[PDB]
Amino acid sequence: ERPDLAWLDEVTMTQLERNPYEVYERLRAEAPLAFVPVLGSYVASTAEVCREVATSPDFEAVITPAGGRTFGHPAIIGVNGDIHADLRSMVEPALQPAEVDRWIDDLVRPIARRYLERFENDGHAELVAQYCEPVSVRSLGDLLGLQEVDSDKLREWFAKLNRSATNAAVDENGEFANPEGFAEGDQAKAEIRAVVDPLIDKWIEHPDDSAISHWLHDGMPPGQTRDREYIYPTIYVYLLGAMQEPGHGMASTLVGLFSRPEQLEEVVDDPTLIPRAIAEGLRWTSPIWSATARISTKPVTIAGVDLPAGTPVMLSYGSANHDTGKYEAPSQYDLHRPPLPHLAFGAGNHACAGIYFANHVMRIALEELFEAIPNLERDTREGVEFWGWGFRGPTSLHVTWEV
Numbered sequence: 001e002r003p004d005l006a007w008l009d010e011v012t013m014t015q016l017e018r019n020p021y022e023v024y025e026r027l028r029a030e031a032p033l034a035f036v037p038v039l040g041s042y043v044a045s046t047a048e049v050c051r052e053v054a055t056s057p058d059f060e061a062v063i064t065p066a067g068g069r070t071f072g073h074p075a076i077i078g079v080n081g082d083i084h085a086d087l088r089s090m091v092e093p094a095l096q097p098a099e100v101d102r103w104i105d106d107l108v109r110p111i112a113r114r115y116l117e118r119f120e121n122d123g124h125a126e127l128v129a130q131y132c133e134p135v136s137v138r139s140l141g142d143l144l145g146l147q148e149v150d151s152d153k154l155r156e157w158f159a160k161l162n163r164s165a166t167n168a169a170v171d172e173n174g175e176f177a178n179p180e181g182f183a184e185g186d187q188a189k190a191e192i193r194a195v196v197d198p199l200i201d202k203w204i205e206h207p208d209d210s211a212i213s214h215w216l217h218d219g220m221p222p223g224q225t226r227d228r229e230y231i232y233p234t235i236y237v238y239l240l241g242a243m244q245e246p247g248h249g250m251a252s253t254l255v256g257l258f259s260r261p262e263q264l265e266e267v268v269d270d271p272t273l274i275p276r277a278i279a280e281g282l283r284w285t286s287p288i289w290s291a292t293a294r295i296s297t298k299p300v301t302i303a304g305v306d307l308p309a310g311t312p313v314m315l316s317y318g319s320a321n322h323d324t325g326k327y328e329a330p331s332q333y334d335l336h337r338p339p340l341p342h343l344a345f346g347a348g349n350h351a352c353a354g355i356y357f358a359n360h361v362m363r364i365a366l367e368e369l370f371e372a373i374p375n376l377e378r379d380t381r382e383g384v385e386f387w388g389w390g391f392r393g394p395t396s397l398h399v400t401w402e403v
């Protein structure tokens, strides 16, 4: 429809998944709010537009089409008003900074040590599968009450939910181009139900300190629980992004540091720089790259585009974090970049609820990794490939060290 952007008609889903940064570099210059045909949606690509849409009183949350097919209702990311307020009040207690600080060290540090002991003397490792993902899912899984769900299974679940929730491609008529791509999401949800329904049955009668037990009971009249159908979509939301993203953030931060060997050495030598390294890592390759959206509630003009009411806008925060209006050479990882605001945790009333927790998980994991393997080096025989448009991270991270 927009004539000068006719080249967007030839952008493919595979291209965006393999590397979205060249298309989005053009979008940020040509059309900070642009309709991308293969995605079937307007997309916000700059920091100014993403922040404006995410915080505007004329927009509210909406789930992406593939997200809605994957999660249903009421996914915390896709609802508003009283339901959103209730779901926020449900999840926020265990994520409060004063609460996290009471137990985060005793949670994550023994988990990190357990996985490190399996390989720290091998001299080689694939850190995504052997360390980053397991620590991320084991830490959250224990907090949630899924202690008996193996980390291999949690990792499989977030991979399947990832592919289902980012199965966004549409055809010429706006219909999903790959309808078969939701089936493995449906299979994961069925497996999750078989595992979690007995745990809920038990928590209803015998509450404990697990987060899901508290989701059932907190704030409820005596003897009542939230219906499991009301909380399952937020359980699924956790089993995708809350499980996946801290592992993604760790791994991207390591890849970035390896790209700047002088900076990797600084951080190993001075672990107090790890939080700064992670913040730059999240900006440099945002784990949640383009997974959420908002919808206009009235006619509104954004970046020169007059949008009717009811218009969805995808928030490509991963592109916003390479906005050259804010950052110098954003495609380069730079630990010594001035610490500026970033959008890797989103913005507004639907901004990430788990920032403080996530930052500590990533911090502790990297502290223990560098303590156990100070001479870590990247395996330069194997290149690092990143994959993902909705969620983005390295598919593997082969490293070596002198034993």
Ligand code: HEM
Residues within 6 Å of the ligand: 054, 076, 077, 078, 088, 091, 095, 140, 241, 242, 243, 245, 246, 249, 282, 286, 287, 288, 292, 293, 315, 317, 343, 344, 345, 346, 347, 348, 349, 350, 351, 352, 353, 354, 355, 357, 358, 359
């Ligand atoms: C590095 C790790 C993480 C990153 C980069 C990240 C980023 C994000 C982003 C970009 C959003 C969408 C915000 C928006 O639409 O404006 C989000 C939402 C959310 N995140 Fe995080 N997240 C991470 C980890 C976690 C963890 C570990 C948890 C839970 C323990 C969590 C809980 C949530 C919740 C509940 C929401 C939905 C908020 C709402 O819609 O009201 N996140 N996150």
Ligand SMILES: COc1cccc(CO)c1O
Residues within 6 Å of the ligand: 067, 077, 165, 236, 237, 238, 239, 240, 241, 242, 288, 291, 292
């Ligand atoms: C915390 O988990 C999520 C955050 C934002 C988006 C999704 C899925 O679209 C998530 O699962």
